[PDB]
CSV table of C-alpha atoms and ligand atoms in Angstrom, one decimal:
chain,number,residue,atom,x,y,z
E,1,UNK,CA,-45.2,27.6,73.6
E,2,UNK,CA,-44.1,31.1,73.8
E,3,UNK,CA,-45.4,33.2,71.3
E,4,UNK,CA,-42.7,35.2,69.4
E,5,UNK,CA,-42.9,38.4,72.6
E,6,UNK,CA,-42.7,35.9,74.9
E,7,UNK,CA,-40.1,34.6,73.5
E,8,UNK,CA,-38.2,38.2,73.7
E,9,UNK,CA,-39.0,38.9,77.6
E,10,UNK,CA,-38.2,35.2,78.3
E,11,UNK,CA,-34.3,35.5,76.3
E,12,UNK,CA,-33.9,39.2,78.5
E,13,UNK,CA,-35.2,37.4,81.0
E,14,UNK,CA,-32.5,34.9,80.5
E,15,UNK,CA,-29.6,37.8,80.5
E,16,UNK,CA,-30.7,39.0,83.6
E,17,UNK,CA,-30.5,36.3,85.6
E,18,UNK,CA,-26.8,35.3,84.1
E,19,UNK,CA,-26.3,39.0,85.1
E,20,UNK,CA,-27.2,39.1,88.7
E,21,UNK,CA,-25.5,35.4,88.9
E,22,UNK,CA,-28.8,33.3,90.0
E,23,UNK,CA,-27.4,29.9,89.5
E,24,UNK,CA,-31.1,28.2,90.7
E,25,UNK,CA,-33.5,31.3,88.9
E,26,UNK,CA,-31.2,30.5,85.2
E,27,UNK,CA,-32.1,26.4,85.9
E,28,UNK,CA,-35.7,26.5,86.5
E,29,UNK,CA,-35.6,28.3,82.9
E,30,UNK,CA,-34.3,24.9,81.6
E,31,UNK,CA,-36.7,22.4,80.6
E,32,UNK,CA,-35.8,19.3,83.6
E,33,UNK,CA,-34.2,17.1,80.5
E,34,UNK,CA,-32.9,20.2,78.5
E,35,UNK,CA,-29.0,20.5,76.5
E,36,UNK,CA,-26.8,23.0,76.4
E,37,UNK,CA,-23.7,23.3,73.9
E,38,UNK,CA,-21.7,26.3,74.8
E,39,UNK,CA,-19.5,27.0,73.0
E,40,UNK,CA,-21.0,25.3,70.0
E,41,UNK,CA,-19.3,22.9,68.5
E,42,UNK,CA,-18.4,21.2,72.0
E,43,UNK,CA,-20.2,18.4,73.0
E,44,UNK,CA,-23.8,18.9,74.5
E,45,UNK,CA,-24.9,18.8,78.1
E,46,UNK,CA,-28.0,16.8,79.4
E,47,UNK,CA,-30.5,18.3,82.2
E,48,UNK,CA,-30.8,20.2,84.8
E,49,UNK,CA,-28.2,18.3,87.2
E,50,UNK,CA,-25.3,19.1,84.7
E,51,UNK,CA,-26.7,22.6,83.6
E,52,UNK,CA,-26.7,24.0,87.2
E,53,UNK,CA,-22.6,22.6,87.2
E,54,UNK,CA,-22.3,24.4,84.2
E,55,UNK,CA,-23.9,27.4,85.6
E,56,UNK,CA,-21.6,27.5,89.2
E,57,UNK,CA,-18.4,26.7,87.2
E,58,UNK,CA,-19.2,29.6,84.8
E,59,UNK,CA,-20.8,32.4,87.3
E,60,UNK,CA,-18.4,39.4,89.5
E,61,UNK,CA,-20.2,38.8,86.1
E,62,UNK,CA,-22.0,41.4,84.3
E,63,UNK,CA,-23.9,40.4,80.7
E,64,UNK,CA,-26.2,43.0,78.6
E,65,UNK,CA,-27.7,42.4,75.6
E,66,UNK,CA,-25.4,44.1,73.0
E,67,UNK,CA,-29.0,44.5,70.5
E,68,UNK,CA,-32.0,43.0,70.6
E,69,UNK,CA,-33.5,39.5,71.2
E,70,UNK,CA,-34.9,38.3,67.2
E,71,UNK,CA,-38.1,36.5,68.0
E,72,UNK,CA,-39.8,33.2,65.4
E,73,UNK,CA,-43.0,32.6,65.9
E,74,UNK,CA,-42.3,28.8,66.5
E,75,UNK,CA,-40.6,28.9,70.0
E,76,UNK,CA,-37.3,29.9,69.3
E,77,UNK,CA,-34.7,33.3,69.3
E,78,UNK,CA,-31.4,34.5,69.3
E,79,UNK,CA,-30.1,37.4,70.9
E,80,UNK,CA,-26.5,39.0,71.4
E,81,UNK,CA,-24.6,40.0,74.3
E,82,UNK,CA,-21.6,40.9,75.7
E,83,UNK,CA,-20.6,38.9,79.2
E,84,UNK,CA,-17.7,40.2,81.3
E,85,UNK,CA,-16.1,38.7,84.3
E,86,UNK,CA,-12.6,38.6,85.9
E,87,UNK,CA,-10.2,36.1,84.3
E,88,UNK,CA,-6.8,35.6,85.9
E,89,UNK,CA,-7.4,39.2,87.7
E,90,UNK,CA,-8.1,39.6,84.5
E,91,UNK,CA,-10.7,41.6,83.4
E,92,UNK,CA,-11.9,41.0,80.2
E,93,UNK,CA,-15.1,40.2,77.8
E,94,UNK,CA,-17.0,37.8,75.4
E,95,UNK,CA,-19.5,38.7,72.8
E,96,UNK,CA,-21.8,35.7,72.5
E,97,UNK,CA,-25.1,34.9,70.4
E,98,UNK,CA,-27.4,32.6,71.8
E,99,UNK,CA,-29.6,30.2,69.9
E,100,UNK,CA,-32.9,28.7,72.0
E,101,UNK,CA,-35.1,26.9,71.6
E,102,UNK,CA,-38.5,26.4,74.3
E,103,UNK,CA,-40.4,23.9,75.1
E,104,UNK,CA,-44.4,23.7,75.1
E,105,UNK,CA,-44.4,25.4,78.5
E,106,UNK,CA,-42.2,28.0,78.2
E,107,UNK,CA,-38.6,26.0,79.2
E,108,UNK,CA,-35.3,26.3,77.8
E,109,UNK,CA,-35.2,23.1,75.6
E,110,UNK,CA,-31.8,24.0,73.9
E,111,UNK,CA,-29.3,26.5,74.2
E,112,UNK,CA,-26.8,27.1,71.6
E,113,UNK,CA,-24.2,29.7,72.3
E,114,UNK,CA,-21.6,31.0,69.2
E,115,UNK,CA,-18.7,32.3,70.1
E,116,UNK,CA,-15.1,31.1,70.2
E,117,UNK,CA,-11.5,32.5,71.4
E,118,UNK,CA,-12.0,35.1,68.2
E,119,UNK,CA,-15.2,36.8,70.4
E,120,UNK,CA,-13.1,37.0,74.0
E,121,UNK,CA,-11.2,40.7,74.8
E,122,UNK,CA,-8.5,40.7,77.2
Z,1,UNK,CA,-13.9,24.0,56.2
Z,2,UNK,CA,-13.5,27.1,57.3
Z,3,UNK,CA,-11.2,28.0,60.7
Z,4,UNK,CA,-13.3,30.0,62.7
Z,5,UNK,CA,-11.7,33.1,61.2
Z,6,UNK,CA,-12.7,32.1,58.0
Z,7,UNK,CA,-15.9,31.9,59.2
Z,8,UNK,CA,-15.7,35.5,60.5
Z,9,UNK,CA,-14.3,36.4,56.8
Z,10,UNK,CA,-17.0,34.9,54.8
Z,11,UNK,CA,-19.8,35.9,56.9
Z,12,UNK,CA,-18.9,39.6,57.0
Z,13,UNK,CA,-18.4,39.2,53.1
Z,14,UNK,CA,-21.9,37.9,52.8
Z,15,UNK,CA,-22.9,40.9,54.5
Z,16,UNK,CA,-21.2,43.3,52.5
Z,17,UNK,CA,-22.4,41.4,49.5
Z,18,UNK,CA,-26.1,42.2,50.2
Z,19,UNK,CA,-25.4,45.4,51.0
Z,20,UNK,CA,-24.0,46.0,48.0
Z,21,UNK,CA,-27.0,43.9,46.0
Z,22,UNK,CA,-24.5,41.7,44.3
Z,23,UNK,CA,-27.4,38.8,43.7
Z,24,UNK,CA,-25.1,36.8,42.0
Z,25,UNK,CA,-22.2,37.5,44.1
Z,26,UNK,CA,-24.5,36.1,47.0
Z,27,UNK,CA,-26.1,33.2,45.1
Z,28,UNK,CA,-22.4,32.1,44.4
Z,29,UNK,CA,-21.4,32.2,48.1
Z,30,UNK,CA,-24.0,29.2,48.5
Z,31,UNK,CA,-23.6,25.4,47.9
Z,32,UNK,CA,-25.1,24.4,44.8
Z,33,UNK,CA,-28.0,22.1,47.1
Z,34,UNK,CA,-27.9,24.9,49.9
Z,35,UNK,CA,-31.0,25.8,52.3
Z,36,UNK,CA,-32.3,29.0,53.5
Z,37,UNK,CA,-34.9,29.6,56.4
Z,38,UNK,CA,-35.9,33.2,56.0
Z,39,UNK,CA,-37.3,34.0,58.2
Z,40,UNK,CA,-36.6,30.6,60.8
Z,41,UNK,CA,-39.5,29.2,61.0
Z,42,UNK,CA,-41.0,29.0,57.6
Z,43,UNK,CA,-39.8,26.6,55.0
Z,44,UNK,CA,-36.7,26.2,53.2
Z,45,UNK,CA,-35.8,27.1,50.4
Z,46,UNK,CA,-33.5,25.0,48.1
Z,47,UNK,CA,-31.1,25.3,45.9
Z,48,UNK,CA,-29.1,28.1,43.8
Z,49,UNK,CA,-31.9,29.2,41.7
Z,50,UNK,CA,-34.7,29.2,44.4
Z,51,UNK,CA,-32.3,31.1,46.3
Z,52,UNK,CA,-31.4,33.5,43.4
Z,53,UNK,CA,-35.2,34.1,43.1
Z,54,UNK,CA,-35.1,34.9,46.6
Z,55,UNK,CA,-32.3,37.3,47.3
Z,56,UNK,CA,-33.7,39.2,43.5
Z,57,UNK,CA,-37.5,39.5,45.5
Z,58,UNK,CA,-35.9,41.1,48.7
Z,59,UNK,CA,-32.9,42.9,46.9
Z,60,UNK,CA,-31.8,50.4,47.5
Z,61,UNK,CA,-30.9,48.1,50.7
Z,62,UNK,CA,-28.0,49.0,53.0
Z,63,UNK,CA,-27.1,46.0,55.3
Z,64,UNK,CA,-24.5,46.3,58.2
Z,65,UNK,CA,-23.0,44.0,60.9
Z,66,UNK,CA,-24.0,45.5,64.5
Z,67,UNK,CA,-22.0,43.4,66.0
Z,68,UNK,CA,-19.2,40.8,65.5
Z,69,UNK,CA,-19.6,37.8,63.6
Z,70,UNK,CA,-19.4,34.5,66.5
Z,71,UNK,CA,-17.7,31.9,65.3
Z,72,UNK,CA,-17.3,28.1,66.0
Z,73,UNK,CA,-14.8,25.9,65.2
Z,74,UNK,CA,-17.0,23.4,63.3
Z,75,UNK,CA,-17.1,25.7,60.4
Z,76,UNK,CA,-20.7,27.4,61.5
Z,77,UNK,CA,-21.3,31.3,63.0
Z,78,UNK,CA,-23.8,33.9,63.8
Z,79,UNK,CA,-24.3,37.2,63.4
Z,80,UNK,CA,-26.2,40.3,64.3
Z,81,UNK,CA,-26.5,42.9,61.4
Z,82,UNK,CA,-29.5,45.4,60.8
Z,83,UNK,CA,-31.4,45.6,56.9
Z,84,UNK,CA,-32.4,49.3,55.8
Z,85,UNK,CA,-35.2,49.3,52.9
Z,86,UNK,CA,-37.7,51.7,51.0
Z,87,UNK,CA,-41.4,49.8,51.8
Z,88,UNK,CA,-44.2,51.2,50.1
Z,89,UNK,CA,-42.0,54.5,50.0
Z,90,UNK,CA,-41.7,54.3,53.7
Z,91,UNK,CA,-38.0,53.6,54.7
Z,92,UNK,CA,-37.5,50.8,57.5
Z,93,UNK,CA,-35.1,48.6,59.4
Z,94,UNK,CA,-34.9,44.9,60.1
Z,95,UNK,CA,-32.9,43.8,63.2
Z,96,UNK,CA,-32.0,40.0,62.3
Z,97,UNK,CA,-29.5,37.5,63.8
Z,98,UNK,CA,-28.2,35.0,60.4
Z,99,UNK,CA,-26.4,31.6,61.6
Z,100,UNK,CA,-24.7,30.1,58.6
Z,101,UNK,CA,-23.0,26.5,58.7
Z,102,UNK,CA,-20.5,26.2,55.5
Z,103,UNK,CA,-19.6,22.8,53.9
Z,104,UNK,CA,-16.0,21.2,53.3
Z,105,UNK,CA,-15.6,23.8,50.6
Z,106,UNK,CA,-16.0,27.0,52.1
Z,107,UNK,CA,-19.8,27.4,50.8
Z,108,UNK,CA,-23.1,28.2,52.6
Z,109,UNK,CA,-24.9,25.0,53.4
Z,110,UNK,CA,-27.2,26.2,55.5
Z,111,UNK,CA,-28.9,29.9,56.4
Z,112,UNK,CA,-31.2,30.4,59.5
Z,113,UNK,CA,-32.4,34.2,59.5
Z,114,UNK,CA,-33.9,34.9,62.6
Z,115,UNK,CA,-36.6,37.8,62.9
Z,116,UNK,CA,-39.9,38.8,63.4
Z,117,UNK,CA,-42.4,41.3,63.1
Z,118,UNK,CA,-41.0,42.3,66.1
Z,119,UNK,CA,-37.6,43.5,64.3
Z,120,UNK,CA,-38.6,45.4,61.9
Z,121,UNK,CA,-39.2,49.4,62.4
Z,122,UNK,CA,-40.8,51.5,59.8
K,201,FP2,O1,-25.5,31.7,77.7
K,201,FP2,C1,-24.3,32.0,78.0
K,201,FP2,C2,-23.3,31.9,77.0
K,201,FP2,C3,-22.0,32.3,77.2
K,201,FP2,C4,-21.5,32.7,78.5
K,201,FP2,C5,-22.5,32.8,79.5
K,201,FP2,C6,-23.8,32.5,79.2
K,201,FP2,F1,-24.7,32.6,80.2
K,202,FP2,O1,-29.6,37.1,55.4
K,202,FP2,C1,-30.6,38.0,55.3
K,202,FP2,C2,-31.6,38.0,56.3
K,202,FP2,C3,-32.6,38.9,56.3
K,202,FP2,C4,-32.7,39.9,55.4
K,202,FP2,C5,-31.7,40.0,54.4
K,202,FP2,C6,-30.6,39.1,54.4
K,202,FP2,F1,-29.7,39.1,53.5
């Protein structure tokens, strides 16, 4: 269970991989049975099968952290960022937070990302 | 229950509210039974006047958004902001993330302030 620095490289970890767009490197982060609600508020989704769908649906991206990742010391952070990608030829960007929590061997047990129409810049 | 710009409103309030050090101002904002984890991962807190206790411990203070407030649509956001304080005469910063669900009436149910060690800068 990552201790409260592991938890900040595994979250910049995280943004690097949605950055470069490694749909299979951003799964194996997910515990095999893990959710994801994104945004939250919408209904969760269940393991690995669905998550990678999620991923390929989603992800030219480009996401940075826009500060840093804030660390507990029981397995969980949330960190900011900014994601941009090309809507509609579209340019344009979302600010996001992510909420996660890991697992007992350092996977992605849940993943709560807040943001809504408010956080997206055409 | 607030729209997710409400959401954005109050939680940008609260933040001006401890930067100001309006204790009661902030104790107000909460629901009468409300929790706060602070930091997430220790125990809650409960209630106006353990809260009131709490906010008149850690609260000159200067507290600013460093980021937008991320809203959802089922009256819950987060937020990055940072904390500048005077410990043992040595100024310092806390970089936290706050994620705040609010009740049918527009009040703080529930506050998880996430932070570690590993946030703060003297
Ligand atoms: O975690 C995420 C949240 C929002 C958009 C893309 C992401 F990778
Ligand atoms: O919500 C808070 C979190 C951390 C420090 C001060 C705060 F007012």
């Amino acid at each position: 269970l990552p201790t409260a620095q592991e938890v900040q490289g595994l979250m910049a970890r995280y943004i690097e991989l949605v950055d470069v767009g490694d749909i299979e490197a951003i799964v194996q982060m997910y515990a095999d049975d893990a959710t994801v609600e994104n945004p939250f508020g919408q209904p969760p989704i269940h393991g690995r099968e669905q998550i990678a769908a999620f991923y390929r649906q989603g992800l030219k991206v480009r996401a940075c952290l826009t500060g840093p990742v804030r660390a507990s010391h029981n397995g969980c952070g949330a960190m900011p960022f900014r994601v941009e990608m090309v809507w509609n030829g579209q340019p344009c960007a979302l600010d996001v937070i992510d909420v996660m929590r890991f697992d007992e061997h350092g996977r992605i047990q849940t993943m709560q990302a807040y943001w809504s129409e408010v956080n997206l810049s055409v």
